[PDB]
């Protein structure tokens, strides 16, 4: 699609609530509710706090806001049924109003790992609604944002140029004696000046795994410094990470830095259309073992992105394999390796094409 | 142990916290508890650490799990020596699944709350796992611990108050028309950052709304308001202040709406005392709110909780909680919501025998 406006044609989300509906069909489900951020997205075309939508299987959907907001709501999203309320209550007995109307008996709810997808809620529905069965919706919600259509894909590539000049600004700051929280302030600051509304900054001086970042660790001479960055435009994530060396490196970092190295060639040349994402785990891990590396070998070397910064494909809490398939949009390598030092990381976002990977970081 | 407290606390507060908490399971005939909200993590363990999964026996040492590599470093920053290192997110699941079953519990505590990892995907799959295992709410119970704050604990927020009142003097200094609200945030954000806060939240209003994160396309313009609420930390706890600026010249229902908010403040802080019941003080806002030709206007939810949240129990709510000394409490949180934006003046103040103290 061309010529669309900055955030989006409306017609975009029109056409993926009709398709979201249509999948609502197959499946015998009468009614949604959206309340996880990035499906509302999806869904409506704008963030909007806190994320209340219900979509009925036919007919016209409704978002509820907070009295005074359905104007700047209705300016930003093609939904024209919009509740005000002025209490959280009025809230739930809105949506159980919708329920009753439709004549609603299975209704979709995403048990999602993002806000607002939290148990209080899908308590009360329960009691509430209790003619009503509630049916895990995440596999169809997640199974439309799969694939990325091509606007999904320029948005990536937005995100991907301003996720560089984040790791651009820590490049030129990180050296000894800056904390972790000083090295992520600037970074944070040019990802927020070029338009990311919602970044996320790691910066790790020890090994750690999700490293946010800690106001007194601080970057020390002959050491490694390691930064992640998911950072978006229009609500869709890059995500890229870096590592550095600060001063001379010992011998078992180099050791590490050059085993991910040729893990991460490993994974590029064997992710391609058609095969099966554990087909390259097994890869990398049997690369690990014969490098002496066994037991650091994480598993889940790749995930979507989107308007998650991690989505499916992606490792959870193993019934059938997922094969990549074009125009997903894959992180890649997502793992650290852990040494002492700290957490061994490089990361990029890729474009699945039919015949390669197209690097957008 | 020594009352001078190191710059995270000392290990002391937090094993005491958990001795306690393992007493209320016991009280309540919890065999264990799952603690996965990164807040009570925090208040149990010490550290901050993601994600957040810690293992509390009614009876014994606590179990943390790490992915692998992780340990080590954690054991410098807690108190707490049982720690399991995984390889992938499936072992995790199945270590809390394995530590359950040997230990024969049948009644499981879950925080039901509002934030990470409190989701309901890992809810979905625990119940699975653990058919037999009936699961109880226990936010009532951590929160009734974390409602009522420690002298330590009163002095991270003092900190984060004072933090808070630098980013907002950064605020007050940049508001300009021109200025995008995602361009103030910006420079909100770094200086909170920079002066120690590890976790910040920042909210920059051009147009009404309650859940004010910023849009890179929302601009200041002539004659107009910007609100600005801020959450930041200190070790972890927050302090919560909002303001609301006007650009130019404020138009008639601007300036009645502030006068408006002036006495709504005036009420909430002297009806806000021991022993009062939090709804109590809101009918009364709601009432002068009514009487003042605000009805339209407001918002229920006039306070809330401060803590390792920057919102958590006790707020107003339908369903009782009396207000009690040493409590946080953040006054007042409702906006007044008009055409020209969301009418805000908020601050976070220390429950004391006779009066609130304001800390921001
Ligand atoms: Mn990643
Ligand atoms: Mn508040
Ligand atoms: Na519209
Ligand atoms: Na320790």
Do not use: C
């Not at 959280?88 to 109003?97: P, S």
């Not at 590592?243 to 078992?252: A, I, L, Q, S």
């Not at 991910?260 to 390259?280: F, Q, R, W």
Request: proline share 4%.
């Amino acid at each position: 699609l061309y010529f669309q406006g900055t955030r989006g044609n409306q017609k975009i989300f029109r056409k993926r609530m009709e398709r979201f509906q249509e999948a609502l069909k197959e499946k015998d489900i009468d009614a949604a509710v959206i309340r996880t951020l990035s499906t509302f997205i999806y869904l409506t075309g704008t963030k909007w706090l806190r994320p209340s939508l219900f979509v009925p299987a036919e007919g016209e959907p409704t978002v509820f806001v907070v009295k005074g907001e359905a104007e700047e709501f209705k300016r930003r999203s093609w939904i024209e049924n919009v509740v005000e309320f002025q209490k959280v209550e009025d809230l739930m007995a809105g949506v159980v109003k919708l329920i009753q109307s439709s004549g609603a008996r299975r209704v979709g709810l995403e048990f999602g790992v993002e806000r607002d997808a939290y148990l209080l809620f899908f308590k009360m529905f329960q009691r509430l609604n209790p003619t009503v069965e509630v049916v895990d919706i995440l596999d169809i919600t997640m199974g439309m944002r799969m694939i990325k259509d091509e606007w999904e894909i320029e948005n990536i590539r937005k995100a991907a140029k301003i996720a560089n000049k984040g790791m651009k600004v820590a490049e030129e700051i990180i050296k000894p004696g800056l904390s972790e929280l000083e090295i992520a302030a600037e970074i944070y600051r040019e990802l927020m000046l070029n338009g990311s509304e919602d970044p996320k900054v790691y910066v790790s001086t020890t090994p750690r795994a999700h490293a946010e970042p800690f106001r007194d660790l601080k970057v020390k001479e002959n050491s490694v410094v390691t930064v992640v960055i998911g950072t978006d435009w229009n609500h869709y994530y890059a995500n890229m990470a870096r590592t550095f060396v600060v001063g001379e490196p010992n011998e078992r970092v180099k050791k590490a830095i050059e085993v991910k190295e040729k893990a991460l060639e490993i994974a590029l040349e064997e992710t391609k259309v058609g095969v099966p994402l554990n087909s390259v785990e097994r890869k990398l891990f049997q690369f690990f073992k014969e490098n002496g590396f066994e037991d650091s070998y994480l598993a889940g070397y790749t995930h979507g992105v989107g308007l998650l910064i991690e989505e499916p494909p992606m490792p959870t809490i193993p019934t059938r394999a997922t094969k990549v398939a074009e125009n997903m949009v894959l992180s890649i390598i997502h793992t650290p390796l852990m040494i002492p030092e700290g957490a061994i990381k490089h990361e990029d976002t890729y474009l699945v094409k039919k015949d390669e990977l197209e690097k957008l970081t």
